[PDB]
Design a protein around this ligand. Structure first.
Ligand SMILES: NC(=O)C1=CN([C@@H]2O[C@H](COP(=O)(O)OP(=O)(O)OC[C@H]3O[C@@H](n4cnc5c(N)ncnc54)[C@H](O)[C@@H]3O)[C@@H](O)[C@H]2O)C=CC1
Ligand SMILES: NC(=O)C1=CN([C@@H]2O[C@H](COP(=O)(O)OP(=O)(O)OC[C@H]3O[C@@H](n4cnc5c(N)ncnc54)[C@H](O)[C@@H]3O)[C@@H](O)[C@H]2O)C=CC1
Lengths: 469, 469
């Protein structure tokens, strides 16, 4: 049979997206397709399982849903393993976002605005946890080892962050068949809309690292289309206004980075700028608009609060369908349970390409292997690839990334990845300290020791503490 | 004939060293050897020329000394061109150290301790000037271009700083036959003395970048000798005491870097540490001893004052020999005019190897060419090489540099070199700003603009200002 296992399936809205796409995919919506939903939180797991089955029935799909609390059962014989899990210490927390928010406050308590995990070219909230991302790296490596023995032919589709660090560590240290997934490339489509360009007429390409990708090719009617962006910057940027904290693709920060690097940063890359745009909230609002972006002391906690409420609402919704089995989820909540239209994420298209040879162009985190010849072959890059039955095939990156992107952006970010991996495998707190010694916000060595001490001493970091002892 | 040209021969004590070594080298001390002394300062040039000829006569050497104020005359048909020049604006200064000290004060005025040119892994005073080192890079490139046309077979022996940036820029942008020289490797000999080891019994090697070299091999009696350093750190480091501001090879800073990186930094590399050891003068004194090293607000200006006095003393000494031609410079000032013993620098041994096939092991700045396979072939490294009649031959670097040296030290330093070269060739002040945006001491973007504005506005930076306009 076709076994697709979702690790961390309590991520309900994302689980239902995966389920909905599988049910609305002709080649996968079969009785021979088994979706395994696995999670450590019983309440969330059950809620997801109930909503998933009710959702599948309304879509009239014969795929069978199986829930399990055993990671081994989900991994055993799986064809594809989707890791969207966000570990947490259940003695003190209910989800993973809590540990990152709390340590971030300890960081700011010691003079590190937005926490020590916020660094130059690395501002995306909740991306790394205490630099080395111990609980997240640990789980990914555990799955990889269990996978090599129990599912030798499976693909580990890593979505939990940090995608870059994790995918690199698993590939380098286990040789497991892992691929990192993120749809940050989707930002290009707002560029085309703002410039009044039919996407189908645009010959474009992006490449870089996760949350560090650049519009290296942007052409229209047989010519470079960047002069059209120059015109927009001069005639329409002064009136740009963000629709919500997440709206940053066409922000002053994005264009200032374009002016310097020569290519437009795409997606979360705009969030991952130098400290020039992130010294404080006032600075963020100058460069990202009224909200100050999403990675600040106001919007980040607010967004995480919305997520918690959304979890409970969906839990209670699962109790509603059990009491009222006659309701139609697709009718009363069409947004959360779409019908007909696919989500647009890359996970299921990827599965449909490997399993059913439905060839598709995707943007995935895979080893360089000479694609960006100036970087090592084994470094995991976010590259344009065509996926089919027999492997993943990297496109040629043309034009190549600019000289400034390589020396001022890609390499510093690649080195930070290496710093973080070294901090994990070495189990040496001195590596963590060295990373903060390169941090602009550090004023003294004694400051570094103190912020790390308080972080390590938090009750829910007992495991992390013993790891580095 | 054999034409050896010294560009910047007003560097008298270094010029006399070069002359003394040539006169005391059997194969070079010939009537067919012409030493051309060239400099833009008439007083210093003449003083050096007079002291040089009197010195040669007392050594009973037939080499002829020629002084000239024409760079073209010195370069024309030269076999070896030694660039020890330190440019300066004569309308406001008398030597090059003045412009660096003054801009350093402007930097500290704006909150950049020890000036913007002091950066992590780059604390050596007077190494770079306003990041891009415009006057020094400009002169080196001028010589290289004049050299390709007027002396196609000559070697440009670069000694003026920044050696790394300059040698890289000349090689990459002109293909001139440049080699960078620095004798920082000599620090290893103090290690052996402190550990009671006969140098001739030590199988050792160093490699890295200029002022960024590491004792990668340290063996004694067929075993790794680093356990002998571990013993010294435990039993003799607590009583270590610097003899002078320059004494740092066995300092707490050097050993702390050894503990983290796994190999001992050698020479100026100990000065080029992270900000952990250089936040302020008190911190420097904790890690370097009572003097706080040499790169601080007390010792650096004091050392530069000693140099100025030494220049005048030697100028007046040149007036003495003209009035008293009977005096013996080798007798009344044996230190400044040695006799019998060679200096130990690598410049003349290098010349004697290329010209007379006197094969010797040296440590020179040359393109990697696979020696450190993890780095690009064209990056200029400071490597162990054997020089003879027909080329420079790189030794195998074994053991390889540790993983931490590469990701935490060598690569960040190599990237800074690329930042500085980009800042020079682009003529784009935004590149300078980006470098300071990665500076830990920066608190705001407006601070960056202001410190650069005041630096660019200094009268003796008119040329630099027009360059970046
Ligand atoms: N790659 C991408 O496109 C993006 C990355 N993410 C990442 O995806 C992850 C999940 O994000 P959210 O859904 O918002 O958080 P969430 O808390 O709603 O989902 C995490 C789920 O994983 C469960 N789980 C925790 N530990 C587990 C373990 N050992 N084994 C199995 N299941 C476990 C948790 O109980 C929870 O139900 C996060 O790490 C987040 O950073 C989120 C958005 C974009
Ligand atoms: N590679 C190494 O081992 C070391 C590097 N250095 C570098 O060597 C350089 C010289 O150092 P110092 O002798 O202490 O300074 P210095 O001021 O005593 O010598 C510089 C000489 O170059 C002259 N000169 C200036 N502009 C010239 C031009 N266009 N053309 C020809 N000659 C010119 C100056 O008039 C002066 O006489 C400096 O750049 C210094 O940083 C110094 C010590 C160690």
């Amino acid at each position: 049979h076709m076994k697709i296992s979702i690790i961390g399936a309590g991520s309900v809205r994302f689980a239902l997206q995966l389920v909905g796409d599988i049910a609305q995919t002709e080649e996968l919506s079969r009785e021979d397709t088994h979706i395994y939903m696995m999670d450590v939180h019983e309440r969330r797991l059950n809620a997801s399982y109930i909503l998933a089955r009710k959702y599948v029935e309304e879509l009239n799909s014969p795929v069978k849903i199986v829930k399990t609390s055993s990671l081994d059962e989900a991994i055993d014989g799986a064809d594809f393993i989707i890791n969207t899990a966000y570990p947490y210490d259940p003695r003190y927390h209910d989800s993973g976002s809590q540990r990152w928010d709390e340590v971030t406050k300890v960081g700011e308590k010691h003079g590190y605005y937005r926490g020590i995990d916020s660094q130059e070219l690395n501002m995306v909230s909740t991306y790394t946890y205490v630099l080395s991302s111990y609980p997240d790296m640990k789980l990914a490596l555990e799955i990889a080892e269990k996978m090599k023995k129990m599912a030798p032919k499976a693909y580990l589709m890593q979505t939990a962050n940090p995608v870059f660090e994790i995918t690199q560590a698993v590939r380098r240290w286990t040789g497991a068949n892992i691929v990192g997934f993120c749809h940050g490339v989707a930002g290009v489509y707002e560029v085309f809309e703002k410039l009044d360009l039919d996407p189908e007429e645009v010959d474009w390409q992006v490449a870089g690292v996760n949350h560090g990708i650049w519009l290296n090719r942007f052409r229209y009617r047989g010519e470079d289309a960047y002069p059209l962006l120059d015109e927009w910057i001069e005639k329409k940027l002064p009136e740009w206004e963000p629709k919500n904290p997440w709206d940053t693709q066409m922000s002053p920060a994005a264009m200032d980075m374009y002016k310097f690097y020569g290519m437009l940063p795409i997606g979360d890359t705009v969030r991952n700028g130098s400290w020039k745009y992130h010294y404080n909230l006032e600075t963020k609002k100058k460069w990202f608009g009224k909200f100050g972006g999403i990675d600040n002391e106001v919007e980040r906690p607010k967004f995480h609060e919305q997520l918690r409420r959304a979890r409970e609402r969906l839990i209670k919704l699962a109790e509603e369908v059990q009491q009222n089995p006659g309701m139609k989820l697709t009718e009363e909540h069409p947004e959360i349970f779409p019908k007909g239209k696919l989500s647009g994420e890359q996970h299921i298209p990827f599965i449909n390409a490997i399993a059913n040879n439905k060839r598709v162009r995707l943007f995935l985190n895979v080893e360089n292997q000479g694609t960006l010849k100036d970087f090592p072959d084994d470094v995991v890059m976010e590259l344009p690839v065509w996926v089919d039955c027999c492997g993943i095939h990297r496109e040629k990156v043309e034009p190549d990334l600019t000289h400034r992107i390589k020396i001022f952006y890609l390499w510093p970010r690649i080195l930070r990845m290496e710093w973080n991996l070294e901090a994990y495998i070495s189990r040496d707190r001195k590596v963590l300290e060295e990373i903060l010694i390169r941090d602009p916000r550090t004023k003294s060595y004694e400051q570094i020791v103190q912020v790390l001490d308080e972080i390590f001493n938090l009750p829910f970091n007992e495991e992390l503490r013993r790891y580095y002892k």
